[PDB]
Structures are given as C-alpha cells and as structure tokens.
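re: that complex we talked abt at group meeting.

here r the seqs, copy pasted straight from the sheet so there may be weird spacing, ignore it
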Amino acid sequence: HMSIITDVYAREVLDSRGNPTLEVEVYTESGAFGRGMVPSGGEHEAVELRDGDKSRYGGLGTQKAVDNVNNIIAEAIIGYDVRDQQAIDRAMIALDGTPNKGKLGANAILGVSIAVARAAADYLEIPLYSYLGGFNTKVLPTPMMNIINGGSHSDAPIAFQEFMILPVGAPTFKEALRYGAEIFHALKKILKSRGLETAVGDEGGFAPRFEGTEDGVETILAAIEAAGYVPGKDVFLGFDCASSEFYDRKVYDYTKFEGEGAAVRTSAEQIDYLEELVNKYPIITIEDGMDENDWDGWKALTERLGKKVQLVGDDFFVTNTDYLARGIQEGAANSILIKVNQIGTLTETFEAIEMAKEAGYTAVVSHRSGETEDSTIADIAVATNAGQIKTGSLSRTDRIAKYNQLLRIEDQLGEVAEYRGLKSFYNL
Amino acid sequence: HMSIITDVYAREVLDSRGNPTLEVEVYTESGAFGRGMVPSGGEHEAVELRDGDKSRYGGLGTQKAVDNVNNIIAEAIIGYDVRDQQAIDRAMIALDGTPNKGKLGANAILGVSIAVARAAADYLEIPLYSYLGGFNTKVLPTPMMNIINGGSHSDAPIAFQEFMILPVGAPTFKEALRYGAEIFHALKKILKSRGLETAVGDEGGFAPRFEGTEDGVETILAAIEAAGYVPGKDVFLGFDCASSEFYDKERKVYDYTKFEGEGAAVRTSAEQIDYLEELVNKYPIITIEDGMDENDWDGWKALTERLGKKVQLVGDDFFVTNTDYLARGIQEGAANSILIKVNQIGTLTETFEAIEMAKEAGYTAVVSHRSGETEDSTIADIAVATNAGQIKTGSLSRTDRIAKYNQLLRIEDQLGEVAEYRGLKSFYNL
Amino acid sequence: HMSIITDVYAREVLDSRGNPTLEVEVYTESGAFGRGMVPSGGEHEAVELRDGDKSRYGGLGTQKAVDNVNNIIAEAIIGYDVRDQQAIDRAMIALDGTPNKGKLGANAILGVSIAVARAAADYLEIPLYSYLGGFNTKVLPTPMMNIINGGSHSDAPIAFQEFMILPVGAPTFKEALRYGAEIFHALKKILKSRGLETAVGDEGGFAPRFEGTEDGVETILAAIEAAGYVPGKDVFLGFDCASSEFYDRKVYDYTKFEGEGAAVRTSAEQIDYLEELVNKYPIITIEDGMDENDWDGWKALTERLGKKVQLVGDDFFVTNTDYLARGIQEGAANSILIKVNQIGTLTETFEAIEMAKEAGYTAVVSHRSGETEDSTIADIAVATNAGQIKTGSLSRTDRIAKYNQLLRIEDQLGEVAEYRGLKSFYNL
Amino acid sequence: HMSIITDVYAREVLDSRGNPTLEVEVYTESGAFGRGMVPSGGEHEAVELRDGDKSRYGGLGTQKAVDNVNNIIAEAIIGYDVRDQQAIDRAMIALDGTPNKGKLGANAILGVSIAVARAAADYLEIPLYSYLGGFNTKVLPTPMMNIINGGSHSDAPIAFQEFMILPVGAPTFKEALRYGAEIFHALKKILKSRGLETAVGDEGGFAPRFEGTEDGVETILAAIEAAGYVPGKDVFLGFDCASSEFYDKERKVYDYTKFEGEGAAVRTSAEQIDYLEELVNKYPIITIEDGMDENDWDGWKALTERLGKKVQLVGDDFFVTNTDYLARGIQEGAANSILIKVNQIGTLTETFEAIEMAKEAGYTAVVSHRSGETEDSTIADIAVATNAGQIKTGSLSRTDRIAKYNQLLRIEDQLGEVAEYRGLKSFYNL
Ligand SMILES: [Mg+2]
Ligand SMILES: [Mg+2]
Ligand SMILES: [Mg+2]
Ligand SMILES: [Mg+2]
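got the structure back, here u go
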C-alpha cells in the first residue's frame, strides 16, 4: 500500500543555541514526506540521549540517538501504515523498554513520532493540526510571550526567571501577535533610553539590569502603555518563577538571586508574596510559584490564588501524567506546561493534554530553550484547542517560526478561527 | 497542464527581529507547492515596500506589498508554467516598471520569485539547489560566521561592525559547522569568565564591552585556541568594517572617533589602507568587507592594489548587489568579491546574473543573510546551486541563522560522496 | 521508482568521416530515453578505445568499447536514479580505474554520461540545457566558424590550420548564423571566380590553393564585405594556428607548410608575428599560437596580446584541469577549448568550464573532426552560458546540426535569450 | 482525446549546404512529439516555396513557407487524430489547391506530413518504420553509395554525374556499410598517392580531376580491390548519367563535348544506348540512372528493350516522383526503377502510393536523398517500411549522409534475426 512507511532516517542538526539535536525524515511508498526536528531536553521524565564524546560539541552530539533511529527504530517501524500513530508510538515505547526512554533516547523517539505524523498529514493532504485533532480544530492560542528574564537567566537582582505578556484582549491571533510585537519594540526603546542592554537571551527577550522585580514589572507595564494597550484589559502579565531554583531548609531564599538582604520566605510567606504581586499587578498566570516537591505549598497556593490566577506546573509536573494525576487529586495547580520532548511521543503528549482538560486544567504547549525551525507545537495547540501557548519572545526565528505558523493556521481557518483570549482560561 | 501556476498568495508574517515581512505561496495545477519568505531589506538598489501606517507595527507593515502580490502579480503570473523562472522574473520586473522595484515592492517580487522556484523544484521532485543550478552542484560553502560585533552594532569602542571566523581547514561542511559551534561556545565561556555580556545581537553573535579592536580580535583568537583549533590554518578571521559608517564625506577621512572615542585615529584613505594592512600582517585575516567607503572608488582601487592578492576584499555597500556597480568595480580593479543579497536586487534571475558576472571576473560571490531573517533557508541552496564557495549567514545561535547551516548539512548529506567543501580553495580570487 | 535506470545499451555507428564511433541508449523504468553519440577522439588526456582489428574498418572499430558498455558499465549503472549524473560519472571513473579512461574507453564512458543526462532531461520533461544548467540558462554562444583551412588541413603554403569568422555584431544567434552562412556562400562565389576549389574538408570549410596566409585572410575579408558585413564590427577573425604542428629545436618552422623560403621564428619572433597579424587584421582570437609545451612562450604571448586578443589553449590544455590550473597560475592563455571526449564525462567537462570561468578564462565548447548527428555541445554551451562555441563551417550536417539546435534553443528561450556577441569575451 | 494534434509549429533551419530549409514540430494532447525536417527541393513536380528576399540568405529563406505552416496549416490540422496520416495529407493537398503544392509550398506540406507521422509513431510507442509499414517490415536496403562525381558536379572531363558502389554481396546492412566505408577510405588513399583532390562534394564523395570516365571507373575498381572486395560479386557499380545535362534538344543528341571537351563523342539516341551497353559489358554495372534524357521517351524504351533485363534503369528526372509519369513509363516499357524523392511529391501518402505503383509494375523504388540534406533520417525508415530493397543516400562521409546509414544500423539492430539484407535479390526488376 501507498500509505506504508518505506523509510525512516535521522541526522544530527543544530538547535537555536548552536548545540546538536536531531531530525528524522519519514517517507511513505507514495512519496509522502514528513520531517520532525526535536528541541533540547528530574528522575521521572524522558531522557534525551547525548553522545558524551567530548571531542565533539562538548559531549553534546546526538549521533548515538541518530544511530538508534537509523539502525533500530527504522527497521521496527518500516512497514507500518503511516497513519497508525498510536501503534507506532507504542511500538517505540516497547522497543526502548525503559520508563524514561533512555535506551533509544527520548530525542530519537520523538523525532520519529513527529516525522510520522507529518508524513501522515502529507499523505492525506491535510494540515497537521487537522490530522492531529480531527475536524473540530479552531482555537488559536492565547500566547504568553517571554519579554524579560531574571533568576538563572539574568545577572539582575530578580529571583523569578520569566516575565511574560499575554495579549488576551486581541480579537484574533494575528492581532494578538501585533500587540506583543509592538510592546516588545516599545520596551526595547525604553531600555535604550535608560542605557539598559537590549541584546537578547535564548528565547528572544531581554535580561536588563533592573533594580529589582518591581522595576522589571513596571518597565513592562510602561511598554504595554507606550504601545497603546491597557494592562489588565488588553494585556496581562505572567511569571515563570521557577521557584525550584531558589528553594532550599524549607524556604524560598531570594538572596540566591536578589542579593544579601533579600527575603527568605516560608511556604506561607511565598504564597503571601505571590498574592501581594497578584494584587498589585495584572498577573493572570504564575508558573512554578512553589518548589517542584513542595506539594503542601502547591495545594495552599492553589487554595489561595487558584480561583482567579492560573497556576502552572512546569518542573512540578514535567509533562508526566502520574504527576499531573496526583496534582489533580490533591488540588495542586490548575494548569500544566506541556513539553513534547519531556514525555517523548505525540500520543503521550495528547494523553497529557486530555487528562488536563478533563480535570479543568489548561494545557500550555511549550517551547524549549534550544529550539529549531520546526513549528509543530503550533499545530498541537490548535489541534487540541488547548487555548494557550508558550513559545518565546518577539525576536529569534526559533520563536517567531511558531508565531508565523499560527498566522498561517489562522489564515487557513478563515471565519472558523477563534481567538478566545481570556475565555481560554477555562480553569478560572 | 500540470506545471501551470494556478495560484499565487501572499501574507504578512514576522522576521527574526519581530518586524513584519511577507511570504508567498505558489501552487501548480498538479498540487506542487512552494513558499517563499523574504528577509528585511542608497538610491541604486531594490526597495522594499512598507505601509507607513504608524498605527501598526511602527509603520513597518507589509500589507501593501502583500496586496500587490495578491491583486496585481497573481493575475499576471497565474497561467505561466512554474518552470519559466526567468520569464516570470522578467514579467514582474516589467509589471513594476521602475528600476528599484518600488511600485510593487522588491519584497513582493522576491517572495513570488522564490516561491515559484520552490514550487518548480517541488513539481520536478528535485532539491532546490538542483533545480536552480542543474546537475553539477557540489560545493559546500566556506562559512564566514559573525562572532563579535562592533561599530553601530555595539557600545564598545570598536569601529568595525562584524568580526567573523572562517573554518577553512575543515574537511567537510559538517565539520566546519562543528568548528564554528565549538569556538562560539568556548568564546561564550571566556566572556563569562571576564564578566562580559553573553546575550546576543540580531545575528546571534556577541557585542561585548571590549577595550578595543585588538582586545576583540585577541579574544576570538583565544576562543579558537581554547576550542583546539589553529588560527591561520584551521580558522581565519574576517572583518565587516562597514567603513561607510565612520567615513566623513566632507573631510574625506575614516574617522575612528565616531565609535572608538575622542582620541581615536582619523585616517586618510592612504592611512586606512595602511591600517588594514597592519591588521592583516598582525592577524590571520583572510577577508575584509567594506574596508573603504561605498563611494571611495580610488580608495577601493588602492586597497585592492595593496592587499587584493592575499586578502579577499568584499563590496557590500560598495556594490549593493547591483551589476552596474559590480561591472564598474571589475573594470576599475576595485574589490575581488561581492556580497550577494537576494532582496537587494529582488529576483532570483538577477541574483544568479550577479553571481555569474562576479565569477567571470574572478570575483567570489558571497551569498548573504539580512539582519531580519526568517525560517527560510533558500540562500543555502543558492550557494550550492552556483558552487559559489562561501556564505555569510550568521553566528552560531538563533534559528534565523542556524536554519541555513542545517539546510547546508542536509544538502551535504544528500550529495554524499559528491559533496566538496573546498575551504581555502574556495578563494579562487586569491 | 520510475526514474531508475533499467537499461544501458551501446552500438557501433559511424562518424562524419565514415569511421566507427559508438552511441549509447539509456532507458528508465518510466520509459524515459536518452541517446548519446560520441565524436572521434597527448599522454594526459582521455583515451578512446579502438579495436585494432585491421580486418574491420582499418582497425578503427569500436566493438570493444561497446562491449565495455554492454557487459561492464551497464551492470554497474542499472539501478541508479537517472538524475544522479555526478555519482554515475564518478562510478564509471572508478570502474575504469585509470587516469586516462583507457580500460573501458573514454568513448564508452562519455557515451553513457551523455545518454544518462539526455534520459534524465527526458524523464523530467525539460530541455537538456535546463537539465544541465538549471534555470539561469540564456546565453547563445558567439560562434567561431571555420571557413578556410591551412597547415595539415591543406596543400596550400599556409602554416595555420583554421581560419574562422566570428559574427559578434549580430543581435541574435539566428542572425549570427545568417551572417556566417551568407559570408560562406559569398566566399564560395569568390573562390569559383578565381578558379579555386570549393569542395570541403572535414568541418565543412574550404582549403583552397591560396598563395599564402595574407591571401587567405584577405579573401575572407573580401567575402565578409561582399556579404555586406563590416570586418572588425560585425565580424572578426579567429585563427587556430595549431602551432604544435610546425614547432621543432626551439623554433616555429614555417617551412614545414609554407615552403623552402618560409620564416623560422624563435618564440619571441612567433609572438612578434602573431602581433603583426593582430595589428593588420581584425583578429579577436588565436588558438594554439604557441606550442603545447612552450610554457614560457605561452606566458609571453599572453603578456603581449592577452589584454585585447583571446588566446585559446587546445593542445596546450587538452581539456585537462591540471593543465588549465597550471596555465591559470602561470598567466598562460585566457581561454580553453572544451572537448567533451578529451576528458570523457559531463561532470568533468562542467568542472573544467567552471574552473575556466572562475579564472576569468572563456570556455569554448568544441566539435571534433569526426562528428555525428548529436548536438549535445550546443546544449552544453547554453547550459553554462559559456558564450562561445566552435562547431564548424557552414556546410555539413555534422556541423549544421549544432547550429540548428542553437536555433531551437534560442527560439524556445524567446525573449529571455541573449546573444552577447563581443560581450561574451569577458576575458578581454 | 490523447491522440489529438494540439500544435503544429514550423521554424526556419539550415540544410547541409548552409541554405535555409524548415522543420515542423507536432504535438498531441498526450505530449507525443514529432519533428519533421525537409531537404532542399521542371513543370510537373512539387515546388518548394522560397522567400525571394535578396537581403536574406540570397533569396533562399523559408519564412513564407514557415508562415504557411504556422498561420494556415496549423489551424487546419490541429484537432485531427495524429494517426490520420492520409486524411491530413489529403487535407493539406486540398488546402493548397494547386497540383504542384506551390501556394503553401511542398516544403511546408512535407514538413507537416513527416512531423505528423513521427508524432504518431511516438504516440503509439513504436518505431517509425513499423508505424509507416505495419508489421511485415524486414528488408534492409541495398545502398548505392555515391563515391565519385562528374558532369555538373566536377571540373573533370566526365559527362556522367554520379558513380556509385553497391555492396550487394554483404550478408547484412551492417556489413554492407563497412564494405562501403572501407572502399571509400581505400579510394581516398589512392587519390592521395596520385596527388588528386580528396576534399568532398555535397554528398560526401570525391570529384577528382581524372583523365576521363574509364579512369574514374577503373580507380573505383582499384579501390574496391584494394579493400579486399571482388567487383561483380561483392560490389557492383552504378551510374547517375543525369543525361539530361548534356542532351541537345534541338539536334536530338547526347553531346559529350559539354563536359568531356571539344573532341568528345556526340551520340544519337541509338549510339547512347550502344555506349551504355559498351560500359555495361566492360564493367560490373548493375544500375544506370537517367541514361537517356528526361523527354527522350523512345530512347528510354529502346534502352529498356536492350539493357532492362540485366541492368536496373532508374528514372530520376524522367519520372520526378510523379505517378502520372511513372504510369506512362510502365505502360510504354520505359525504365524498370524509379528514384523516390519525398519532397519532389510532398506528402508521405503520395510517396507511398508511388512506391506501391512501382512495385506492382515490377519496378524497384529507390528512396533518395537530396543535395541539401538535414540530420533527419526518415528516408531510412521509409525504405524499410516498404521493404523497398534499395536506398540512395550518399557517400561515406558527411553526417547528412551518414545519419541515414546510422539509422539503418539501428533499424537492423532493432529487427534482430528478422532483419533481411537481400543484396542482389533486392533487384526483383531483373
Ligand atoms: Mg519553567
Ligand atoms: Mg556589511
Ligand atoms: Mg586546435
Ligand atoms: Mg539523378
């Protein structure tokens, strides 16, 4: 048959940080074709396989993973119908035979998973989002756009890692994207006028030497306004606190990043602080506000702020349905960051999204620090009507490629497309 | 017939700086498809059309250009055979009817030009580089990789704009890429150890606050050596002086005080050549772009007389991908290389004519990125299609740059044993 | 796949002189078809394989070469994609395993090389020139048309071998061809009026019993004018001195062909003479003005005349990139005669052309003395925008077939076609 | 439908003498393709159309004929099934509406006729000879190969125009070709050893300054023997006397002084027959073309009465590929063979009718080249298609001639064990 996979081929390529990753190409007998590139990527998440050959790319080569694709996975999957995504994904999971995908490499597996899906869409002559999600695909995601960085991502005295804008008030994704771009550019103008640095970090945002968190937040609010948008109507704020990076015993220790005199907060006090911020600023989402293991803290945070703020588990959940299931049961968080490569197959990715939806949690499809020209996550967000996406700032094609794909998908959907904005926060 | 173009469609999208650009999609009756994305783009080069609507994207929208594609060019080109690239390019040129492509927009035109070629390669089921260049495509380009920035792209006291590494000594493109990546990463470590900034500029390189040019150069040499490579054997240096940015027209001088502070040198054309020669004798420099001002024709000739035998001398602003300027340079013995910017001329046909004119004069043609890039990697295919031998498409971070390097890896892989990375032998001009 | 070569078949056929050559037919699985005929053809050039069976065709049969195609090359190449020209060419080079292609025969190899390319063009349904050169093919070559012959090609007291006209001033190839035809016919009228012979030699030109070189040259100038063209504007002259045929010690000895009292010139004096001719007559190109081994002579000639006369290496370079590379380095010549069968593959042919272009040398694609009905060289000249061609006089279909193909290619290119005339001499 | 002609296109090209001719290209809806090139071409034969523009090609341009194809015939034939050769030929004949094809041009007509047939063979995916002649095609023709020329084609004192060798004794066409080639080459050596000219005429043969007919004939016999062949067993001779060129209408004599000098014979018709008989008795001559004048009907009959049993007697100018002339010749017992010139009649249909009329009378039909030829080899396919058994297509040099021999090699090769080269048995007229 014409839909039968005839070839599966991987090669080593580079990511947005100049570190190796891999891509896989799948062909069907009919000549349908898919390419799947893998982004960069706990003891309970999928492991990427790196070579450890320090004569090449500082040990970060992916040739072993590539060899696993070409010499092990290829022979197992050639012969399947390209459309049998779940069976293929499951076959790979069983072939690796380890929970963490560490034998074959989560990178090897995911590359194939994606390439197969793209080859199947190509075979059926339909867009990837339709192939993945069926006919009722229509929701363009509300983007959370990383504009300013702190913590491990800065030398400024700021504990939180990501500061985002969310153009919830736009009528369309196309407009939402323009809002973000204009705010980003306004911000850059502001930074220069203050003699602050406008070179960018890994996700296309700035890490300027602000005096502190409030400075950073207020500067963002200033850019929103200068661009002609209304904070708390057109545009909200989001944080990735990545609170695990300053958690140590039983305390969130801000001195790690905010200098000798910074606060050292108990879990009760951390919740207090996040609440202060939320009350002071138009913050609609907080990722990793509590530590990856502070389960009681997560529940309390969620008790106090979960009704009117999105609380996203990133390191708390590591795209792991066992972790998400427990969070759902315990009343911890109300949203999950979905990293395809943290789990390693499209099937498991979609299972996570669906588990989250069924619990009333939002599923926020996410980029990684090391990205590629692939835009599959855009198609995933629309395929599942997830309603939100986290794929970077407004510079760097590693980020902009995803926004561009969303523009295409919106364009292609025509009058059927829906950008729900605030209404995508069904968790609130 | 199945090769006939049935639709031509443009939309506004964003570039790597978050500024609008456009893309075009071409379809044939058979269902072959091509997408052409256009990068960001004086008085004798192609002009991109911007909306000037200060209510959107700070006046940088491309909806007028998109409308020109959809409402004027589409009409004109639908019905051509997708393979008639030259006829289509020429048709667009005549339809605009102005030298600079300013009625339709060079952006509108180039987007169609690229999308058509990509749709044709898709129709024929061959790689773009084969479509564009025929069967004898084999040369992987030696990349000049922008690692450190100065001048208008830094707040460090450094006049020159781009400092590049050229991994000429690698056996393959795949190796050459690794050499660059490893040097880039070693440099980043060095910068951190010195408390210098490692965030990146438009092209994915660093703009650290070095004490001066020699500091910057010596830091690159240190990174090369820390990565285990030998400067002047494995890796050479390249500059983009962008000397037009510090040339005083009126006093006919290269005034370094513009970027290097109050006490910096103010050089006559003779002294500028002297200085470039000093650098070339002190450091393993194999290429200098815009070493003299865009209008300093006598200076270009003198520079070329003094250094042209041993150093590549690339006209960027000197030539602006303009064959009338290139023809004059060839005739006067000015420069020995040209930076080829597809969107500075506006069609693939004219791009390839420029490359061929350069080759025939013994000049190298260095296919180049723009500051505002996209996920498109067509320039990779152009470099290989013409066996040009060199490419200039950024540092070793940012997918706007890396996408091109990744495509070069694919092309190399696809060519197998036929691929040739010529390294230093690509400098046929020297 | 449909593009896969399924058959490669050679047979012995005849050339324009009635001597054996060969042709090869290539078929793809889809039924695409190409036929490659080989023209007739130093210790450092490709060797054609002849049978040496003096019971057939005076030892000039090509059945061994044909057997090499059918029984060795066929089995090696069947299975390749027809479009993999370089790999196929390289495969053949390795299969022969000798520098000079003397095991299989350069004739066997080239026949396959050409037939494959023609089958690939046929497969893709595009013209050969497009297949070979990609999309940017447009330059119709300025032809150098051999009108009068001397030296080894005549019994007249004339040392130089070929005298050519170059209709540089025509607006189009179609016009250029007419200029040449009309001049040729005018010349024939002139020859008859003088009781001179108008039967033709191997390339379709005349070898009349002129009194000397000046007589021959002036007779040509007379024909140019009688046809209504202006020498030195519409039409220039070209020589093939083939100076190797009268070089012996350290002198160009004209007595070999021009009788007992002819000049015996040192290399300095030969340069002097060529300069005299160049100053006296509208000569734009001189092939083999110095001997194949007179390297210092070639450099001096090139120093003295290279700025405003094309200096073509034929025996100097024998389509050998090692020889061309050295000439480029030494400042010897500024043009190369490209004989496909002197090197033996299309790939190496195109590499030579590209090496020449990059040095600022013109590449003049050439016929051989023994030609066939094949017109591939026409397509090669346009494919590479080489700008010039050398393919004979204005009689004999072995020559006219190439001119006819150029008319077709010009016709097919429509308004894109460019005949650059003098501007094709980018070396000057 | 897929077999429908969708385009018919002509262009001006050149013949083997460097004079304009034309070609036509035919396409069907399926993409099947044929190209028909036309060779160079009294009052009862088809007339080629020439422009008469003395500013181009000495008045020999074919642009009017090309325009007739493109602007008149194309219109009329587009829409026919490509396989309807007769209907198309007849349609062209009616569209011209003159006996001689002088309105459209026989050249315009024949180019379309050939191109259509070639496009049809391409459509059906069969060889042209099979398309034209059906399944029972097998006879490779015995070639009459013009080696030496006299009369109007020489300045030697020789009245007869063509002297030919016929390799009748070879087992195959491939061998027959070799025999000719080797004899041709041995002759060239002989000519050089005697200081005679070896440059060639229009048909690739020699026109040396021999002392007379017997010298020329004996030199050919010497070449045959030097090549190791036996005259009158392996190889016979043929003449084209072209006797019309030396026939004095008014004194009703064959006047040899026209070419053989002041003292040459002046023969009555009875004496001409006597002379031809002398030659035939002295030399291994198997065929004589135009032995009598084009209008010497009684002379043709008498010649045929005297020599027709043992010698082939070919009407060229006597018949001008005209079935009214052939019919009269058959009826009066004049000649026993006809030279078939496709362009002297102008369509493939009429060509094949002539061949068939000849066969049915016991006359051989010898398919012939013209002085101005092209790279086309259709006449080879015609010879085999009709099992005609003989061909006249030149000497053993010049691709205008050799292309036909090469095609015959291909056809022979393609037929395999079915091919038959009948040699002397092709002379069914004797
Ligand atoms: Mg996080
Ligand atoms: Mg520059
Ligand atoms: Mg020569
Ligand atoms: Mg005759």
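couple things i noticed - The longest strand of chain C covers residues 5-14. The longest helix of chain C spans residues 173-193.
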